Design a binder for these strands. Structure first.
Length: 74
DNA sequence: GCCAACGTTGGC
DNA sequence: GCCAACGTTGGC
């Protein structure tokens, strides 16, 4: 489910077609930690909440959006 | 030229 | 001291 890594998965808190993936760092000082990425319906990758907000504009309110989990967490 | 994966760091 | 957010870069 939602806490699987290495798996592209729907993010139901975002508009239709958005997906999320958690990538485990393979090497270096933070090996084993993770980065979370989002993918637009067109497949473009997004790496931060401000980046999502710039792109989505007023079609979403990301104020309570938790980037790491992909859930709204007021 | 693109882009995933690394490391950096300002703001907290 | 941590980490959200991003810049850089080698490998392609």
């Amino acid at each position: 489910g939602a806490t699987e890594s290495g798996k592209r998965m729907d993010c139901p808190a975002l508009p239709p077609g958005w997906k999320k993936e958690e990538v485990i760092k393979k090497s270096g000082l933070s090996a084993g930690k993770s980065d979370v990425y989002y993918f637009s319906p067109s497949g473009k990758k997004f790496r931060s909440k401000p980046q999502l907000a710039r792109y989505l504009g007023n079609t979403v309110d990301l104020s309570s959006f938790d980037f790491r989990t992909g859930k709204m967490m007021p």
